[PDB]
Design a binder for this molecule. Structure first.
Ligand SMILES: CC(=O)N[C@@H]1[C@@H](O[C@@H]2O[C@H](CO)[C@H](O)[C@H](O)[C@H]2O)[C@H](O)[C@@H](CO)O[C@H]1O
Ligand SMILES: [Ca+2]
Length: 226
């Protein structure tokens, strides 16, 4: 979808950053082959399956540069380390093996074409736009109903890097959902943004990520171009 639907929350001062949920991604029993759990590849793991793992935390105000590379000292071993500052989560977690969901709204600074580019170890699935990610100011009631991924990247496959080129309006806030998994060993997440305006990729999303409370009537976007 080249013209994704946006939202018009018309809230006085919007809340900065996305919401995050972290969940466990345990290795298989210590004599299993391979050592890692393959659930991350089942089609419903990003929808229902992650909820069968342990909730590690629900965090708010995730904003900044969310990109990271984590080098595991060794493979098939659950090891602890920390996420970047932007994630608002300071305590060590199993960086070798975990699940992470981010959701909220993306607001453009300038109207025009935006190319989001992603790469991941092991997995990054992105939904973007109302309906596709979730409904405007109706996130809780549409949370699990996200459609086809607007970008997807899986380590070791024939689509390990992906992009999404969309025409966006600076007036609107766009529902976004980002689902990440590290099954084992190294972990990495790269999201960048390229517009027809700037000369280089944007990697710091501080002024771009927002959160909005759900409302009874919702907040459909009030910019349309048919
Ligand atoms: C198969 C491979 O390339 N590497 C194995 C290690 O695990 C993978 O490492 C990659 C990065 O190279 C990804 O992070 C992937 O998610 C991992 O599963 C594995 O842990 C060890 C064996 O102990 O070495 C490689 O076999
Ligand atoms: Ca990995």
């Amino acid at each position: 979808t080249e013209f994704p639907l946006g939202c018009s929350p018309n809230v006085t001062t919007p809340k900065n950053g996305l919401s995050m949920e972290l969940y466990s991604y345990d290795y298989l029993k210590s004599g299993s082959n391979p050592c890692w759990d393959a659930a991350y590849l089942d089609p419903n793991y990003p929808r229902t399956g992650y909820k069968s793992h342990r909730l590690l935390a629900k965090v708010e105000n995730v904003a900044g540069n969310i990109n990271f590379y984590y080098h595991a000292p060794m493979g098939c071993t659950s090891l602890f380390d920390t996420l970047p500052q932007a994630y608002n989560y300071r305590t060590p977690l199993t960086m070798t093996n975990f699940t992470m969901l981010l959701y909220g709204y993306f607001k453009p600074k300038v109207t025009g074409y935006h190319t989001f580019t992603i790469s991941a170890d092991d997995l990054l699935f992105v939904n973007f736009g109302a309906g596709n990610a979730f409904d405007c100011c109706k996130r809780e009631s549409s949370a699990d109903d996200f459609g086809n991924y607007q970008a997807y990247a899986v380590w070791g496959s024939q689509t390990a890097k992906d992009d999404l080129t969309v025409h966006l309006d600076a007036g609107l806030y766009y529902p976004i959902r980002i689902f990440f998994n590290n099954r084992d060993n190294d972990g990495a997440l790269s999201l960048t943004l390229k517009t027809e305006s700037d000369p280089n990729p944007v990697i710091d999303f501080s002024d771009y990520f927002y959160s909005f409370d759900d409302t009874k009537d919702g907040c459909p976007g009030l910019v349309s171009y048919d």
